[PDB]
């Protein structure tokens, strides 16, 4: 019996493809190439920094990842362009079904929370901009723990804040690596696989695999 | 004053491009595509498994990564092909200058060791096959620590086995992420950048950047 739901932010509720536009507007033609690398370095820097115990918040990791991407592509990223592209993450667009689904889940009397790598500021900005702030009971950031996902200390944070046991909290994630972690932690996991990717080969299998949040609403 | 040198194995002393051949022989035309993904999942699985505290040796991680790669490309990887491709890693070919350089470093009275993610069996096979076994004082595997690089517990292992303080051990690595870790640990680091890549954006900078081991020999 689930009483709450924890959602990953970037790539699950909000689409990061929105960034490719701003990237191509700054570096015409290469927008897709920049965004692709940026996304990869962003994740890599959070994983590697947590392992070396050298933490910096998501915004710093994002700035560092962009600086590496441009330097790696030979692109001259000036100060203002840097700030501009990085500000794009504060205006992501929610996936089409996201807004209506959040309302229905909430209406069913479910506790809804966000467990993201983003800083408390980032998370706030993104959800408020999309005007979805009111539909969330908790907006959790990994920041207080000074470590990123998939470190169990991050997941534990969701269990504490919601005041429920992990077995009554559903974990919804688009990244198969994130779902693997939460599954290892003990959260019953729902994987949102819209693009038909395959799960990671790290010993885990989600409890549910759906194509969008729509299937989640109908799970209740 | 350096008294010993720790070397990363896969990609630093021995070339993993040797695998692309066996891959293309099994799946003609797609050999490069398979190898590329395989290498990436291999590293990802070691990082993610260490973070979830769900360790399996390098050989297992390698088998799992190949199984994901083929399933992800739509390729039918049968049991025998699986074993065959995986056995390729036990026969990698050392970079051209590697053999002669190892002899000169050793001749200079330097303690030489290998600190690799590979299993004790893997490491042994690879170096013995190339006939370089005798040029190494220690062949260290992360296995005993039950965790992979860049976890500091892995690096500490090199400092203990060589019986020297980290400041007298030179760390030679081709992967900029590996060099970042060893640099954080305290090892004076030499990065072997043959293909002109850029260093990672994780706060570190190697002490030396060279194009091959040749420059290392001339460093003494």
From Swiss-Prot, chains A, B:
Assigned keywords, A-Z: Hydrolase
InterPro entries, per database record: 2-HAD, HAD-like_sf, HAD-SF_hydro_IA, HAD_sf, PGP-like_dom2, S-2-haloacid_dehalogenase
EC number(s) from the headed UniProt entry: 3.8.1.2
Result when mutating residue 149 to A: Loss of catalytic activity
NCBIfam families tied to this protein: HAD-SF-IA-v2, HAD_type_II
Oligomeric and partner information: Homodimer.
Stated consequence of mutating residue 116 to A: Severe reduction in catalytic activity. 25-fold decrease in substrate affinity
Region (Important for catalytic activity): 173-178
Organism: Pseudomonas sp. (strain YL)
Function description: Catalyzes the hydrolytic dehalogenation of small (S)-2-haloalkanoic acids to yield the corresponding (R)-2-hydroxyalkanoic acids. Active with 2-halogenated carboxylic acids and converts only the S-isomer (or L-isomer) of 2-chloropropionic acid with inversion of configuration to produce R-lactate (or D-isomer).
Record: active site: 8 (nucleophile)
Amino-acid positions noted as binding an (S)-2-haloacid in the UniProt annotation, renumbered to this chain: 9-10, 39, 116-117
Pfam families: Hydrolase (PF00702)
Outcome of substituting residue 12 to S: Mild reduction in catalytic activity
Name under which the protein is recorded: (S)-2-haloacid dehalogenase
Biotech exploitation of the protein: (S)-2-haloacid dehalogenases may be used for the biodegradation of halogenated substances and their derivatives which are widely used as pesticides, herbicides and other industrial products.
Any one GO MF annotation of this record: (S)-2-haloacid dehalogenase activity
Record family assignment: Belongs to the HAD-like hydrolase superfamily. S-2-haloalkanoic acid dehalogenase family.
